Amino acid sequence: ASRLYTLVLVLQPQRVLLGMKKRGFGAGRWNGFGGKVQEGETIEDGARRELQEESGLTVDALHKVGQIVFEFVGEPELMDVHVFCTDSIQGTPVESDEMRPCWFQLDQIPFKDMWPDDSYWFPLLLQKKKFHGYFKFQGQDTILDYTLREVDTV
Ligand SMILES: CCc1c(NC2CC2)nc(N)nc1N1CCCCC1
């Protein structure tokens, strides 16, 4: 049992777009944009929808760069997060009820104010490698187990 989610990183040669989640799940951490995939939309549809809702941005092409499965102890559904990246965007990012967007230089990623797993898989993202990840959490701060590999098809 899995539930589908999306995550979108706008990564340009010298900068990456992150949003400070302002409420709800993951509040207080920088992250890419995304969320639950709804019934009746593809995963990539959901990624585009969440990006528009959370930043106002639309994109021409999203690229599948990773998949990360998360277990939280005591939670019955695994989280199957599909990670997309894009370089080209359409528009200027603007704040939403959910997200406060900012550009970060690639050597100034705020890892200590991001999900703990990002420290592990974000470099592969930055090196433009495709990857499969798995992280077991207790609560929101403690990774108990993890696996991470580069793959050829996401
Ligand atoms: C919680 C999953 C999660 C995460 N996983 C760690 C297990 C805690 N890392 C990062 N960057 N984003 C995550 N989300 C992006 C998709 C919507 C849900 C939050």
**What DSSP designation does 24 have?**
S
State which residues form the domain around 154. 1-154
Question: What are the backbone angles phi and psi of residue 115, rounded to the nearest 5°?
Answer: -50, 140
Give the Å distance between the CA of 61 and the centre of ligand 1.
Answer: 22
Per DSSP bridges, beta strands 131-138 and 63-72 are parallel
Cβ(7) – ligand 1 distance below 6 Å: yes
**24 burial via Cβ count (<10 Å: 0-12, 13-18, 19+):** exposed
Per the structure, the count of domains in the chain is: 1
Q: Which two tokens stand for residue 62?
A: 């999203």
What is the rounded distance in angstroms from the CA atom of residue 73 to the CA atom of residue 32? 24
CB 44 within 8 A of CB 108: no
What is the rounded distance in angstroms from the CA atom of residue 129 to the CA atom of residue 125? 6
What is the rounded distance in angstroms from the CA atom of residue 69 to the CA atom of residue 11? 22
Pocket test for ligand 1, best of 16, 70, 124 (most atoms within 8 A of CB): 70
What is the rounded distance in angstroms from the CA atom of residue 139 to the CA atom of residue 25? 12
What kind of experiment solved this structure? X-ray
Reported resolution, Å: 2.1
